[PDB]
Design a protein around this ligand. Sequence first.
Ligand SMILES: Nc1ncnc2c1ncn2[C@@H]1O[C@H](COP(=O)(O)OP(=O)(O)O)[C@@H](O)[C@H]1O
Ligand SMILES: Nc1ncnc2c1ncn2[C@@H]1O[C@H](COP(=O)(O)OP(=O)(O)O)[C@@H](O)[C@H]1O
Ligand SMILES: [Mg+2]
Ligand SMILES: [Mg+2]
Lengths: 7, 7, 7, 173, 372, 372
Amino acid sequence: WXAXCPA
Amino acid sequence: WXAXCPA
Amino acid sequence: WXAXCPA
Amino acid sequence: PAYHSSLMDPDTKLIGNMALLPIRSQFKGPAPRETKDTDIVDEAIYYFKANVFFKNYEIKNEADRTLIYITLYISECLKKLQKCNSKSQGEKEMYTLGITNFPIPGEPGFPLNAIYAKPANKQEDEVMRAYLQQLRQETGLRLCEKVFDPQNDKPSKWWTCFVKRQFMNKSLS
Amino acid sequence: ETTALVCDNGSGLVKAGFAGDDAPRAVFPSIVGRPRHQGVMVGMGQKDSYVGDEAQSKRGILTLKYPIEHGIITNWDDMEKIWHHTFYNELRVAPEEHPTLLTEAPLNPKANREKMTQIMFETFNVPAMYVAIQAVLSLYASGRTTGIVLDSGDGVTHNVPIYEGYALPHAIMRLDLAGRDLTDYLMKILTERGYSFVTTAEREIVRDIKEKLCYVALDFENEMATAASSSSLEKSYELPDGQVITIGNERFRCPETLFQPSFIGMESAGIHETTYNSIMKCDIDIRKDLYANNVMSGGTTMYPGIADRMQKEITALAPSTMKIKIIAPPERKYSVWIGGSILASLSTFQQMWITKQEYDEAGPSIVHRKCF
Amino acid sequence: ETTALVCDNGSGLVKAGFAGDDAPRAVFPSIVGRPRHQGVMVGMGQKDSYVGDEAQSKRGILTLKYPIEHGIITNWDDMEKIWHHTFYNELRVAPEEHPTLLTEAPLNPKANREKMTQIMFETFNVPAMYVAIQAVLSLYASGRTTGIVLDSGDGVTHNVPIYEGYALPHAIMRLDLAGRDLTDYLMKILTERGYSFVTTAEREIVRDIKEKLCYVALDFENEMATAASSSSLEKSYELPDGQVITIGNERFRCPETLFQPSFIGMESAGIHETTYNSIMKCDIDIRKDLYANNVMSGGTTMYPGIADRMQKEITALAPSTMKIKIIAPPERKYSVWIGGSILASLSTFQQMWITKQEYDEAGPSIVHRKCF
Ligand SMILES: Nc1ncnc2c1ncn2[C@@H]1O[C@H](COP(=O)(O)OP(=O)(O)O)[C@@H](O)[C@H]1O
Ligand SMILES: Nc1ncnc2c1ncn2[C@@H]1O[C@H](COP(=O)(O)OP(=O)(O)O)[C@@H](O)[C@H]1O
Ligand SMILES: [Mg+2]
Ligand SMILES: [Mg+2]
């Protein structure tokens, strides 16, 4: 992901 | 109904 | 709640 | 009755009882292509505006069964298409109606099943299945091009008024 | 053309059957449900609209709506859909083959009657039909000619005093209170206990609960005091999910709303008071006969002990010098349908029908003039 | 144009094959490796990039990186490379000849879907394609219309309650915990035992070890106590170099992380708790049906005894008045692919595809409205 978690 | 009560 | 919804 | 079938030469083959009269269609099925625009579906659409009024039909030739079946399916097509909104939506509805499982002749759920024959061998079963599917698809493609009009993009009242005038008083349903 | 069909468009249920049979052949609630979610699976293009026991079975994903509200139709499309379903899927009888009989509550708007007659004559092209009153059919079913009717249905409660061979149209009282208001009050109180129910599925659940575990109380204060000693009155019910709900005072609280409309906030009187007023408005001589005969019908009057409470209240209000008798047949649920069937079977009624030549001629203003 | 190809971009593995076959024709892991050393020999200028079983074979001199992380793509070049490899080298079928079917986890960003659709329509110019959900295909493979899906894949675990002919998009829960976190925890504990594994090659080795010598424990405390008497539970595994590793409590410790996410430090709940919450959020009536049918799929749910533990936990949490049944087909690994193939074979689905003409005229946003 972009915010929260990686991906 | 139209006036008084719904129906 | 107890029945319906959580609380 | 008076306005019975036409365009049936003796050379035409058959499937148990029905006449495998060629129908011109861009789709695929166990039928050939006829260059002339005339075919079973064209005559059925041409005469449907009057066949409903009459209350009798003598099957002079085997093509009468094809005419009866096509008109009977057209009744349901008109009933389902009355609530149409867009030409694309009407085509979608007609397509999903064509790819269905309706009562095949010789099996329960089929009106006037006495007149029609009961297939016995296996191969003729799917032959008739494919033939009827092709006929339904062609009928759907043929109705969508005249039922709608360039203006108001809605089913014309003139073409859906016959919704309640079920042929022989009953429909497939 | 050998028999006729009698259909009772009950405010909460539909009864239909052939003329001559002693029991209805079709008993399903008036539900017209539609899907509430989007739908993802592709192998289903099924029935955008749902009606009947099917709607009851899959009520968990549908927005159930009652087409008829307090005796007056609100959505005509739903009523036509239910009529088509009952005629074709259940009865499997064409409208042309036999005529149809319809019933409606008293003091209803003429617009509803005209629209119903027009739709019946135009859409289904029925050969003939008629419009009647549930109370008179209740009298016919009971095999009596004099009395007072307590037709407390799911949507409307009304009374119509009658005498030998004639009626009293000027002494008819109609009360909007009915089973639906009782169910709403039951939901409200079940909330005060600790159990919450909002959507229509839980509305049906509470309706079943009331149908199974409700009764009337001879004395309200004594029952409340005994509830203060809550060790022998509480009862348990099993929900579909398996949860158990304990119900105490609510069993005898909601029915008391009939005798105490002030609970819901309605500035009116109870059924006992309304019946007393209706009988008093009648002539003095027929008061004795009306007291001696009190027929009651409807699905809202099956609570055990209701007859005893009504008798006690009427005797207390009425002078204590004569005898008051309450008659409570154990088949009052279908009394209206039985009366309609018997009336249709009558030879003299074979000519009172309204045919299509009639309608071919003028807007259905004809329903009223005649056929009443 | 006789059949279609179904490709499942699994978080850790790729499944592909023809529409109609009962087994996939291509099963290789999603690895895109590149050389890590310099290279000295002159008689090879070979394949700066590596993909597929080739990468697995020569993993000792490559920096393996998974293109997809927890269900969301991170490197588009790697995904395009793997797509090209699968289409050409393995399947040897041109994209134009047949359409392609794609599947993705629920609650994924719209950017991924739009980019995937744009790349598929522009680069390979496929005649048509579609986007679906793994859980619905699992239902199709299982031949059922009602139940709850436990799609615990290598990257994402999610549930989607369903009912006859409709779904419940408001009761979907997605958990990031999946096989990769289990492998990381297994590496961490193997460190506490005395065996160290850091690089990606040993990551694959530990993945195989878990695939071969891991199981769930009905009771955690009892298993720990029996481990205190460690004379019948320890097992040995043979490493490629010949070294032997003895594994004891780690066999039943890592799987317990699914039911106890607190081990990794995640402030969430286990699969049992999430499924219970999802089912509770549904309507009361459909709860019975959901309990009676519980479909599970994915490569993370093959541990023996998992079904029994889930059944015990659900029955303990759920009221002890009904019956809870767990269905564990022995071919859940490829259930998604089988469902996709069956859906493609459906006649009614031949028109739901998305073609180049409508996509170009409308735009990438069309897929968003196509079945959500
Ligand atoms: N077994 C029952 N016990 C108590 N009330 C009932 C029972 N069955 C129905 N009811 C109530 O009576 C109503 C239905 O009775 P009904 O006479 O068919 O209404 P309608 O007069 O509109 O046809 C229901 O709404 C319900 O509240
Ligand atoms: N034999 C096995 N035993 C235990 N786990 C396995 C086994 N085979 C695969 N797995 C696990 O299941 C995962 C792959 O299953 P899969 O369903 O293909 O993931 P995805 O849903 O992204 O396609 C792997 O990460 C692996 O950890
Ligand atoms: Mg009623
Ligand atoms: Mg996968």
